[PDB]
Amino acid sequence: GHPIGLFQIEVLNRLTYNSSSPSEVYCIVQGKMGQDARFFCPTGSVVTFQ
Amino acid sequence: GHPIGLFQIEVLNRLTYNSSSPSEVYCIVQGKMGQDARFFCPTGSVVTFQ
Amino acid sequence: TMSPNELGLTSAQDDGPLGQEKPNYFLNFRSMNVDIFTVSHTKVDNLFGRAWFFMEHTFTNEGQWRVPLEFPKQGHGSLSLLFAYFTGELNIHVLFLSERGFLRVAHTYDTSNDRVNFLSSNGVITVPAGEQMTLSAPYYSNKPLRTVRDNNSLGYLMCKPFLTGTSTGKIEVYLSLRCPNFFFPLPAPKVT
Amino acid sequence: VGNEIGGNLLTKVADDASNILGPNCFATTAEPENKNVVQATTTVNTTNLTQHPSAPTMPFSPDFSNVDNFHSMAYDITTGDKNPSKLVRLETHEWTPSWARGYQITHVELPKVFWDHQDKPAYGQSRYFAAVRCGFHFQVQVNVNQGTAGSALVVYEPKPVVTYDSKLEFGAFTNLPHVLMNLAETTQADLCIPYVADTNYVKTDSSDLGQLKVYVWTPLSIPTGSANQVDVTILGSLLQLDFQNPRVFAQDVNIYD
RNA sequence: AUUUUU
């Protein structure tokens, strides 16, 4: 339903490098539930998996 | 008399490097006897030292 | 006190073994577990203890209905796709929509299509016309575990209706499971 | 002396300037998950040295007993291990009538015969080792109807004997582990032979450690009607086996000088 | 297999 919120990752300090190091790197964002996570009512489906 | 065996040092993963590091290095192979090493009969000589 | 590891600073390559219930905190925060209902709806036994539609068959003759039972990629039962192996009781809910007659129902994990030609000891429960029954088929599988994905992950279901006159109809089938044993969770499924 | 104090020089300061609402800041310092360590792992005759190890992983609440509690395979757990010591048919030759005494019926290359063909239980392992030290348990079987008679000499001949065989007097071979077995009386002979050699270990795939033979003590006296095709079979079992020296697949290696 | 419920 309603979004979890706005997720923003801004640059604080330019990624520094040297002659033998990359001028840009790759990033990965993962997500999971907390130790207090809970789910409650089972409802119909909004999509079909494979 | 009989050889100790076949000694082989094969490459497993290519030696990696960068702009300021060598693309090839030097290696040294040393040999000694184990803590259980023993010698038994003294025999004649097969060579002359200096 | 709290270590920097529990404050967000960690290393993804140091997560093994699988299953690390590490606590995450910061000032003015702590894992708060608040319950709304007297029990869990996340427990495998509870969630799956609730049926879900499977398929429907429209009969005209007294022929037999053989169908490879499998886990759903459609209802809340899809949560099973997160696992690789299953084993346990299987609840089959059958609705016999007919004016006058009887419906023979049976279930087996046996792949042979001839051990079913007769229905001798494959559980021939009888649902009178216009009735519905819920039979719980035991794990009579020849394989210790049932890959959860297989087009026949669940054993085959048989339906040989015993009609009386020109009467015809349709047999809607939905199902759930009793106490399910799932193992070795695999990666989440994709969408169509 | 410094460079780590970041935790109690920030955790305390606040704890010193805190009001009823408690501290407005907490700081904790410690070592990174990726520390400067070295890991070493050793398997059979192997050693893996890693100076940049990572936390080992494994499935959820795993069971490494690896033993099938249902025993879908009803056999001893150590079946595969002992398999190579299993009893096998080493030879089967036919006792050709009219063979004078002393005549050699059949021989058998010891110990390389247990790896005689790629269909021998021990053939598998025998290929990955150059050295061997084992004991034997032979069972020479010879069947003959009651009407017929005769006798054969089943004897074990170490390399020393095999080497100088012609220099030895037959009829004295009874000094070696043997079994004068009188046909029409015994159908099988049993011989338990321990490791016998002038060297601690014998080269795998070698005729060393001697060889078992079967001679004609007294030729076969086969009556007119009686059958005339007597077969002599040699079975072998390894009381104890030991493969030590590692080597390439079935490559001739010299353990001797 | 308090792998019906306490």
Curated annotation (Swiss-Prot), chains A, B:
According to the UniProt record, which cysteines are disulfide-bonded? Answer: none
Q: Where in the cell is it found?
A: Virion; Host cytoplasm
Oligomeric and partner information:
Interacts with capsid protein VP0 and capsid protein VP1 to form heterotrimeric protomers. Five protomers subsequently associate to form pentamers which serve as building blocks for the capsid.
Record comment regarding domains:
The N-terminus binds RNA.
Question: What is the purpose of this protein?
Answer: Forms an icosahedral capsid of pseudo T=3 symmetry together with capsid proteins VP0 and VP1. The capsid is 300 Angstroms in diameter, composed of 60 copies of each capsid protein and enclosing the viral positive strand RNA genome. Capsid proteins interact with host alpha-V/beta-3 integrin heterodimer to provide virion attachment target cell. This attachment induces virion internalization predominantly through clathrin-mediated endocytosis. Binds packaging signals present in the viral RNA.
Q: What protein name does the entry list? A: Capsid protein VP3
- The source organism is Human parechovirus 1 (strain Harris) (HPeV-1)
List the lineage, top down. Viruses, Riboviria, Orthornavirae, Pisuviricota, Pisoniviricetes
Which stretch of the intact protein is present?
493 to 542 of 2180
From Swiss-Prot, chain C:
Q: Where does the record place it?
A: Virion; Host cytoplasm
Q: What is this protein called?
A: Capsid protein VP1
* UniProt function note: Forms an icosahedral capsid of pseudo T=3 symmetry together with capsid proteins VP0 and VP3. The capsid is 300 Angstroms in diameter, composed of 60 copies of each capsid protein and enclosing the viral positive strand RNA genome. Capsid proteins interact with host alpha-V/beta-3 integrin heterodimer to provide virion attachment target cell. This attachment induces virion internalization predominantly through clathrin-mediated endocytosis. Binds packaging signals present in the viral RNA.
| Quaternary data | Interacts with capsid protein VP0, and capsid protein VP3 to form heterotrimeric protomers. Five protomers subsequently associate to form pentamers which serve as building blocks for the capsid.
Organism annotation: Human parechovirus 1 (strain Harris) (HPeV-1)
Tell me which domain of life the UniProt entry assigns to the organism this sequence originates from: Viruses
